[PDB]
Design a protein around this nucleic acid. Sequence first.
RNA 1: AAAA
RNA 2: AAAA
Lengths: 249, 257, 249, 257
Amino acid sequence: PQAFFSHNNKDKKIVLEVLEHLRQSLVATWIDSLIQQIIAGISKSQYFLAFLSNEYLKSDWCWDELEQAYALHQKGKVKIIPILLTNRAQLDLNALTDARRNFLESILTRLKYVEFDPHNMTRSLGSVAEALWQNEAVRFEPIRMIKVNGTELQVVEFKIPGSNLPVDFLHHWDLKIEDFIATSPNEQKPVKFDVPVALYGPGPNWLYAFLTLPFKNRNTVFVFNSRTSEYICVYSKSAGLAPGMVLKG
Amino acid sequence: PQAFFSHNNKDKKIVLEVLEHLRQSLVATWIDQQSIPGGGSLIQQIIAGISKSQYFLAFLSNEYLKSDWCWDELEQAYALHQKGKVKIIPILLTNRAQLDLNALTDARRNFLESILTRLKYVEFDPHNMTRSLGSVAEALWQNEAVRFEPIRMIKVNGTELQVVEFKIPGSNLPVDFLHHWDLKIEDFIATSPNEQKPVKFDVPVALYGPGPNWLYAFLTLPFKNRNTVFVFNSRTSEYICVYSKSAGLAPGMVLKG
Amino acid sequence: PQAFFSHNNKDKKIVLEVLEHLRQSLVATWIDSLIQQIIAGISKSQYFLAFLSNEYLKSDWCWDELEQAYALHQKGKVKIIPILLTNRAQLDLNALTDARRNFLESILTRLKYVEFDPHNMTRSLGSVAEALWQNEAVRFEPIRMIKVNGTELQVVEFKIPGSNLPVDFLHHWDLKIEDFIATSPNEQKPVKFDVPVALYGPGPNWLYAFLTLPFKNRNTVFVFNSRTSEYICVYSKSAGLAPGMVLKG
Amino acid sequence: PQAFFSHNNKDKKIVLEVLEHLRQSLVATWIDQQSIPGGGSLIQQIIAGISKSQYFLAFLSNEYLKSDWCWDELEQAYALHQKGKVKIIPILLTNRAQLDLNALTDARRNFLESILTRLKYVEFDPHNMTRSLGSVAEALWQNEAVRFEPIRMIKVNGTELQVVEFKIPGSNLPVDFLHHWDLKIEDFIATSPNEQKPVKFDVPVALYGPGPNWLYAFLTLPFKNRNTVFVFNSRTSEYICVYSKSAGLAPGMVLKG
RNA sequence: AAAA
RNA sequence: AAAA
Ligand SMILES: NC(=O)c1cccc([C@@H]2O[C@H](COP(=O)(O)OP(=O)(O)OC[C@H]3O[C@@H](n4cnc5c(N)ncnc54)[C@H](O)[C@@H]3O)[C@@H](O)[C@H]2O)c1
């Protein structure tokens, strides 16, 4: 589920670090156009992140990017999530013209925004990440590297919203995990290079097979079974680890 | 689950065709001279892999009983069988009633009678072939974990596909069963259309039957860049496409069965 | 039985903790729109919790949410439960306009409210939770974790109002228990992850089967039999516990 | 409640068809070398599971009584039966009047006569098949807990459904009976439409008969993601849907019987 | 069979 | 077969 970030360099500091958290959530993130890049892939294109801030509002040549993003949003192709670096109370609406203020007020009331602050970072990141997963199918929590039974491992946590997904959901899914696997240890990616990868959370068998298959010759695959609650090794790419061992959690 | 065939060329006709059915059941089959870098034969090839080595198929027949130099192969197979390394399944081409035990010496007859009563045998005949093949194949799966039925090529919704049917005996398997499993599916995938293998080359492969998620992942994973993988979901009972290696097939389509 | 919370951040402190008690009662709770989200599911949608307070009354842009909630409430789709953080005596009705005061007074007299205070918390929570269960079918008390015969277990207590339910009540029930099962020990949910779950209270056999079935491969299921009054184990997902043991209460 | 069948191929025709009726009664049936890895030989396969192992079905017949390779089968079955591990039910294909006892030796006749008088037998004939099958099936359920009638597929309100009828003998069962029950319903659910099993694949399954709530929950739970579950309520006497695995059926509908 |  |  791709993400396009529209922001100003005054907010550059918060943007990548916000994105870095979003990248670990198996989310495609694109920063450095964004207008004609909307028309790419399936109808579920991306969610526009409008990094709204006082300095962001003061650039007209940044404003027109919000127009075409919102103008085609009525077509249903893309949906926007406005991120408020500063609270709504002290947003400098006075400097905006009558057309600019009327446009901004309409999209802040009818369309839902997310408030962000540097202080309560953990809660702010969770609210930002979850809003990405509000209107989306099975979620994807950030990858956590945990050591179980002395073995280093990373967990790919995914939660299904509700209790079921469409039987043809895999057809319209725009998430392929080959793009999130690191090729070098120094290269930063959601999935660490050569580090064993584990899948956690309830789900259908085909969903587990769909995520496990692209990991052949890339990382060691671990599968969690809730019958007894230990991880199951299904792939042997690292030395000393055989397919079938259990990790007592 | 490997299989070693001991037989005579008078029964050669039934042996491969019996083996051909067993090969489609995802069973490793070894008759003459294959891929092991050991010393060949069937005696010292028993000591290879894990304690679950193989099941000796003694193709017992009247002409088979008449060769002494074929008899000693049954001795060393049975002599080390008491150690628990290998178990023998004697296949009777002819019924027990007309087995020529008289020509056998006192030691040979006493040895054969002991292993036919204590050890379990399977009767085979050319006439009732379908039932005979099922009895032979299932005896391979009697003392084994999750079974593997022969691969069947079925066309669903106009799409050619082969089904890998596996059934779990009981309702559970050990959580560490995958460690001691001696079945890796990379050796059963055909590389050329003319080459005969349990899994057809480039033909989409489907997994059928209830089982744990790790078992499905373990079987699906070695099929990357080899065949299109289909997974059966019992919630609504259609096959689910998870891999796209053939043109025109996307991961996520359903096959109404 | 879903619940939508309308409140101000001055009352934020009481809201989640009120909700946390309601979540343990197998109640769907939704906080962070609420207007167009009313039209979802069956006619038994939810009960609007109007967290009425003096600071809540002072926001006009919070008032219009109460209008559309009440305006469509006359259609019978949703019913509102107004929660008074402060007593009716000192509610600042004077600051409200003539239309606002007339609207509020009409809904406080004809429609029933619930009084809440921080001091008598246990009684206040019980009154709030029960008002959710007043116009509803078989109730659901908060989950209690009790240790019987040295075995950790949680009890799902449900009480049937009256002595019978409609034979087709399960068709229109909007409670599926798969959404209330925790997937991780750190994740907070009404049902603890991997902790054995027990069902308590008289009821029909199909109701017991309906609640027990979604727990396969999720939690160990215990059933209470009133013939001799010990819990009966029917599922074995945890080690050392076989289906058929009894817990002397 | 497992069942081991000892018979001769002259009575093969009646054996499976007798077993087929018994299989529909949620009874584990093992004729020869069945799934159970335990050496087919029903003898050492007796020592498996709980003290309530199985009931030996001695398919007694005139040609069976000439089967010396079979006379032994009974000895060890009866010899350990005195230990209380297994009980035998002798099935008389022919009536007691014309049983060829004369050909039997003095030891054989004395052994057979002792077990036919002190231990109870069941008479079977091809002619009155329905009554004979009922007598055979019920003798399996005589010394057993809550019974299990054969599964019947009935169409109620235009909906196809199968009923699992179970009757409790007496009016109560031990509170810890589920601990020692050797019946798990996962082994009786079909995985393919062509595969024959007590429970049809994807066909909704209904539970009928009075019983405790935990017994209903114990039987309903293993059916998740396997079949649609229906529960009968005697308050108003319609079936109640609790699981939705088939399209068009919601949990909560009623079937007017 | 509405804690049998 | 929706963590068996
Ligand atoms: N499954 C087989 O084909 C088979 C063949 C031979 C034997 C067996 C297994 O022998 C076990 C008993 O020890 P032992 O073999 O010493 O004696 P015994 O029981 O007298 O052997 C069977 C006699 O009957 C014929 N027959 C063939 N098929 C069957 C069959 N499915 N059920 C019954 N009888 C069968 C066979 O030719 C012989 O005359 C017992 O576990 C039995 O299943 C299975």
